[PDB]
């Protein structure tokens, strides 16, 4: 009712309790309702505190569209919310997008779903230029080309990154691009250039601290 | 008294009952013919319990009397509240050098647990004195002799309010420079009370 968390946590358990459609109609009604603060992420209501709860509702859409195979509709939901994330504080733009892929890459999805929405961030990168977010998505974009078994497009993205890495450091992102580059040259039967990729990755590992998931791989 | 400031005094008075003192005044603000402020309340607060009437210069009682509050916090805040004569003597000093420019009389009636309701009245000349009760102002000219005849020493609560209300009623009706509603204040050990009287009350007595 008044508290937006009452209609949220109750609808969160409706997934296993009844079905997907029972909990889906609740989130559609919570979109245009329960104004909070700051700017309007819905456009019919202002979202500041509910934006964290609205992200949870978007994560609940990952239980429906991704499992059933409706991601073609979810693929168009991200650019709809992209224009909304350009109104309020932009700190949530990268934070929400970072949590979308984790649920998106679990189910054995289709390559066209992520490629099309990743190009939308590339098309949006012309007006608003973000070198940190575009290169972060390019790491997972080249991973799709690894499953696509096309190494020509995956190398072109890395070559543009390695050219900028000579004048930069990007130590957390420098190990990841070399870690994925080793997967490209290994399936091509190369024991030399593939080994040189992990060689430069271990150099930056001794300077700063890389995360456990990166050091393990 | 200078140009641009409203003349204080007119109808004012205070009476010391058994233990305490009751200040009173009417509500009017006039420069020569008009009423600028009809809610006017004439009071001066140097302390929670100790109050003072607002007389003489209007600009001085809203500034110099607040300057006395400045000098009062260099003593009271360090130790404690002094007697009534201590705070009333500052009115004599600040008006002594400005006597050739700022001319303001002040009637000081305080409350204390020992000296009780002793009143210290300072005329326009800027001299401190000691009187049990005093009445001043240009609008109270009618009630001067009225309070000096039937007055009784150490009245009760309601009898003192009536003694002041019956007196202030003559200055409101029979004067054109004094009028409005009577706003009193109760000074005693029980606390500080505020009362207001309607024109239909003191008119019929």
């Amino acid at each position: 009712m008044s508290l937006p968390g009452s209609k949220l946590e109750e609808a969160r358990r409706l997934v296993n309790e009844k079905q997907y459609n029972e909990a889906e109609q609740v989130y559609l009604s919570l979109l245009d309702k329960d104004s909070s603060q700051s700017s309007a992420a819905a456009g019919a209501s202002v979202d500041d505190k509910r934006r964290n709860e609205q992200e949870t509702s978007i994560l609940e859409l990952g239980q429906l569209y991704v499992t059933m195979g409706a991601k073609d509709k979810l693929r168009e939901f991200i650019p709809h919310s992209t224009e909304y994330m350009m109104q309020f504080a932009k700190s949530k733009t990268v934070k929400v997008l970072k949590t979308l892929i984790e649920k998106f890459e679990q189910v054995p999805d289709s390559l066209d779903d992520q490629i099309f929405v990743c190009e939308k961030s590339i098309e949006f990168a012309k007006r608003e230029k973000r070198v940190f977010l575009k290169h972060s998505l390019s790491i997972k974009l080249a991973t799709l080309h690894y499953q696509k078994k096309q190494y020509k497009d995956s190398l072109a993205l890395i070559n543009d990154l390695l050219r900028e890495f000579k004048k930069l450091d990007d130590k957390p992102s420098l190990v990841d691009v070399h870690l994925l580059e080793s997967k490209v040259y290994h399936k091509l039967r190369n024991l030399a250039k593939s080994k040189a990729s992990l060689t430069a990755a271990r150099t930056a590992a001794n300077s700063i601290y890389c995360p456990t998931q990166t050091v393990a791989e | 008294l200078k140009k641009g400031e409203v003349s204080l005094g007119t109808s004012i008075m205070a009476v010391t009952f058994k233990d305490g003192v009751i200040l009173g005044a009417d509500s009017r603000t006039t420069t020569g013919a008009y009423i600028a402020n009809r809610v006017t309340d004439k009071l001066t607060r140097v302390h929670d319990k100790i109050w003072c009437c607002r007389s003489g210069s209007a600009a001085d009682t809203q500034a110099i009397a607040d300057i006395v509050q400045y000098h009062l916090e260099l003593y009271t805040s360090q130790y404690g509240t002094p007697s009534t004569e201590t705070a009333a003597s500052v009115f004599k000093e600040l008006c002594y050098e400005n006597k050739d420019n700022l001319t303001a009389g002040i009637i000081v009636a305080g409350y204390d647990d020992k000296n009780k309701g002793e009143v210290y009245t300072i005329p326009l000349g800027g001299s401190v004195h000691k009187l049990p009760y005093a009445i001043a102002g240009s609008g109270s000219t009618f009630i001067y002799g009225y309070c000096d005849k039937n007055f009784r020493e150490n009245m009760s609560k309601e009898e003192t309010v009536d003694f002041i209300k019956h007196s202030l009623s003559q200055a409101i009706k029979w004067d054109g420079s004094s009028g409005g509603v009577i706003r009193m204040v109760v000074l005693t050990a029980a606390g500080v009370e505020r009362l207001i009287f309607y024109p239909d009350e003191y008119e019929q007595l």
Binding site: - | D66, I67, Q69, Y70, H71, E73, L74, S77, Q78
Partner: protein
């Protein structure tokens, strides 16, 4: 030449020798205190030592009344303690003269610190190394404690103390503030809050006292008072009945 024992110049270590001796020993008085904040009120407790039979306990105090809502906590040399006290009381009345409201914590703490920072500019006049802590209860924001350091450092403090045992009481209070995730004490009934702060004080000391051996005061809403000899003794006896 180069020594700060008379004049004041920048040392090769980047730290003034006067600032050192001011920060080193503030405990030459050999006294401790504590300051905590309740919900709508503020409770301060200071140790008191009376090494004579001829001393009037009502005269000796480290807590002076500034405004009606404002207390103060001072530790250091006695003659230099009243130098900042007489100035703060004179500056507290200047707020009403200029404004006519009650002195907020963000002003009185800033004025005394800025006045102490001018002493860094003036080489002839001596600064004060006395601990200055201004405690009061704000109307809008509630309780607030700002400790003014002799070098000009002042910031928000949920709790503060003096002496070498300041860090010992801080450890016990940090664990209680971490679980509750609140800076002040949400518990009402300040009469029981005074006994709550004594418990943390006994852990650092380990002994009891009399009614005149402890300087204790409570800053309430729109009022500040000082506990008398009977009010202090009542709390030291009543704390033994509970725990």
């Amino acid at each position: 030449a180069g020594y700060d024992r008379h004049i004041t110049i920048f040392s090769p270590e980047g730290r003034l020798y006067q600032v050192e001796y001011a920060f080193k020993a503030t405990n030459q008085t050999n006294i401790n205190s504590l300051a905590v904040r309740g919900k709508d009120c503020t409770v301060v407790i200071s140790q008191k030592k009376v090494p004579d039979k001829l001393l009037d306990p009502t005269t000796v105090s480290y807590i002076f009344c500034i405004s009606r809502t404002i207390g103060m906590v001072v530790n250091g040399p006695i003659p230099d303690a009243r130098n900042a006290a007489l100035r703060a009381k004179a500056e507290a009345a200047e707020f009403r003269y200029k404004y006519g409201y009650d002195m907020p914590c963000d002003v009185l703490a800033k004025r005394m610190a800025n006045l102490s920072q001018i002493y860094t500019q003036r080489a002839y006049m001596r600064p004060l190394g006395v601990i200055l802590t201004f405690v009061s209860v704000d109307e809008e924001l509630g309780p607030s404690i700002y400790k003014t350091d002799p070098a000009g450092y002042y910031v928000g403090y949920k709790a503060t103390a003096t002496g070498p045992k300041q860090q010992e009481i801080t450890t016990n209070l940090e664990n209680h503030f971490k679980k509750s995730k609140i800076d002040h004490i949400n518990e009402e009934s300040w009469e029981k809050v005074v006994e709550f702060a004594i418990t943390h004080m006994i852990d650092a000391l380990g002994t009891e006292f009399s009614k005149n051996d402890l300087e204790v005061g409570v800053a309430t809403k729109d009022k500040f008072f000082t506990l008398s000899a009977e009010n202090i003794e009542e709390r030291l006896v009543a704390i033994a009945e509970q725990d």
